[PDB]
Amino acid sequence: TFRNCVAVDLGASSGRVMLARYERECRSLTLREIHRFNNGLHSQNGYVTWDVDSLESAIRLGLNKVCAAGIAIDSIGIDTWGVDFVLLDQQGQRVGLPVAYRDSRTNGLMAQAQQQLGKRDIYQRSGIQFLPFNTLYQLRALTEQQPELIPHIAHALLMPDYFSYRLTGKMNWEYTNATTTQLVNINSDDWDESLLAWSGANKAWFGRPTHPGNVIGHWICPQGNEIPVVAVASHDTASAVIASPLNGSRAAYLSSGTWSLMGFESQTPFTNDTALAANITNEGGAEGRYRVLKNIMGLWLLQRVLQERQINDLPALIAATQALPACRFIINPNDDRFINPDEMCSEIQAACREMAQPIPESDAELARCIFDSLALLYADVLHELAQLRGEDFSQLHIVGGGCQNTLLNQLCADACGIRVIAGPVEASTLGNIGIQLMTLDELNNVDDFRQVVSTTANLTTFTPNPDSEIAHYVALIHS
Template identity: 65%
Template sequence: MSKRNIVAVDLGASSGRVMLAQWDAASQHIDLREVRRFASLRERRAGYDCWDLDHLEREIRAGLAQLDAENIVPDSIGIDTWGVDMVLLDKAGNRVGEAVSYRDKRTHGVMEQALRELGKETIYARTGIQFLPFNTLYQFRALSQQQPEWKAQVAHALMIPDYLHYRLTGKLNWEYTNATTTQLLNIESGEWDAELLAWAGASPSWFGKPTSPGNLIGHWRNANGAEIPVIAVTTHDTASAVLATPLTQENAAYLSSGTWSLMGFESLLPYASAEALRANITNEGGAEGYRVLKNIMGLWLLQRICTELRIDDLCALIAETEKEPACRALINPNDTRFINPDSMVNEIQNACAEQHMPVPQSAAALARCIFDSLALLYREVIQDLATLRGSAFRQLHVVGGGSQNQFLNQLCADACQIPVLAGPVEASTLGNVGCQLIALGELTDVADFRRCVATNFPLKTFEPLNNSAFRASEARFAALSQPAKELAYDKAD
């Protein structure tokens, strides 16, 4: 077949889209079109911060219905989302309780319990996953302690994309890349770790064997009765984004920039040494091998500022931000105080005041504080990653929505002192599409797909400048008297 219609549902923690990719095999051309865009809603329910899954499903089905109305029959469908969050089902396949968001505070202190009772080295040796206070390991423990009435009814536990695939097909599936984010998958066997499940209070019977990306889950029937294949793509959105990153040399790193910033490199083998543990490196599953990376609190900080101050014109804000003095006020973006504060404006201002720095008052000053701090943190992380792998990086590929922020891209190049290649913007969607095209036999492998991405979506290069403000601020940033720059409640090694 020379032409294909591929539906990629790409759900981020802030918004979601139903996207149509039209593939022409003869020209190797990919044409992307947004069919429907919607918010990823979180609501307070029963005292918890929860995802509105019914809203997400309605919006996905509305997007598919729109394609039906246009007489477009998809060749396949795939869904990718954020990681760590889960959905509980009973024996009849009905939801149990709520899909509690990773930003909820129910896991506060739970990771510390795990470190005391299991040991940090033991957990890391078994999983190779970064210690984040909201990992699924700690969510299950919180469930056992706080919501035993939910736990008693559970027959299955699915990650968010697996649940949405289930709603389309009626088939259960546990896709590998998202499963690795749980900190419950054994890094040696690739299976669910019985010891960690037992500590978390989760039954092994709730889970099936993790499946590789590209697995056919089942079929969705459209309004005309056509059965459309539903494919388990790289369902973790970062895994999809990395799949679509046109990494052209061995010494290239990637930065998936959006609500979160995920910086790392690809490897056929995991890095789970004592040195990797000290650097809090994570080894998440990819389409091929591992994504060795660190999680960084990304543009979430800016998104919250814009929401609080009711700023709609981001381009105008960035233009004003460029006029602000560089590095006057700096914060640690990975401080857990910024995960979900009541007021991000107040939290940033308080953090600056506590460090005896000028307190940013205007929206532009707040944004400048965020951008400078992120760039300096990117510098620290890329140095950690280079030390771990034993060689310096020569390029940094920035993909995702944040790659459109040319000011931040330049700051990143200046701070890291390597060229930044920006694009593609729709990396998660494209990776979702690429996984489906490979599964359908249209492309051979990831390298084949990346060649298509590079041809279809030209990159913009930002060369590093000698930014004296960054040079002068590196020591000040490194010495911030805040928690170590990790997203963790624990401060000890």
């Protein structure tokens, strides 16, 4: 009567297969890691790609571990990073490469769309922020640059539905992730004909987007009992938001991993000129609650520094970085130059030098620059979001692997001047589990699931410190 649900959560820098054990009567929810694996960009034939075959093998390995253990799997669900897709021919073989959102193939195409279609027009139709690697632009790149591939394409599946298909033999187009494409009309929740026309994609490559909770198909443990594969809020950030223990309308979220996604939830989208000017997104959420948010380049910058400087003790780095004075190096992390530079440290240093700032050079200085520059951007965006909705926030919920960074947690609470509640760490995994339980009739809605998370997970309070260095710095920039 306890349910065993397996969540697959694939992020840009890691993948995980996790097993939840849940039972309603007890309000007890546990999560065990079954298989954790690396994920990352691969340079393949002049492209930045995903190794989807290794990802599938990793997923199967995790699933088969649970099976060989003799556990009764009640359901499986898959969430991944947004925007990206896999093209398939009529027989289900991949067409072309699985190109990553960090690929430069899209360069220039967002501007071209704004010029040809109208910036305001794309925004009012999609309600989605302008990011140069949005699916809208990737499909333009594909169809413009690889016209020979086009006749072979029968279907495009977004990443989570791709793996769900590889498990079930059934195709799905999950709503929350479809919204990341900047191809879904915000008023119809279906593909926008005009945006598809510009992208060169064909509507027949897709299906009407379907809200999470449906059973996509079934998977088979090598013995042969049918395990339902459920369509969850398959956009990782959508899952992370479900698991954020939001307490009513004055709570915001910060989903912190490779990206930092900072936002709130709304029953209605914001596509006004205020929203457009701020480049705010209205991503699809479970229950139709829009995730009104902004992308922030996030810990990606630090991931790259760690590789370049060959730093393998992140906790030590954070500890060292706490000793450094704050706010002497400030970059704008959202600057396009940081999406995928060949030389991350060099790019950071150039950006600082261009502003007549001291140059961050030590490992700890580069991390200090990153953490301070994120926190100042956190404060800017949180202000923009409050201004937009016309309602303050009383708490910021930070979730994701980034919520383990106690330094950044405090800088965020200090810069924003808001209480920060950090946790759960694996929020995307938990939200993935939450949706499965709802399909299993074990759980009634998101708000009920948040009560489970809030009484189950480790939640750590960071109280804003008004006399902090960054508080001092921010107070000063106000006037």
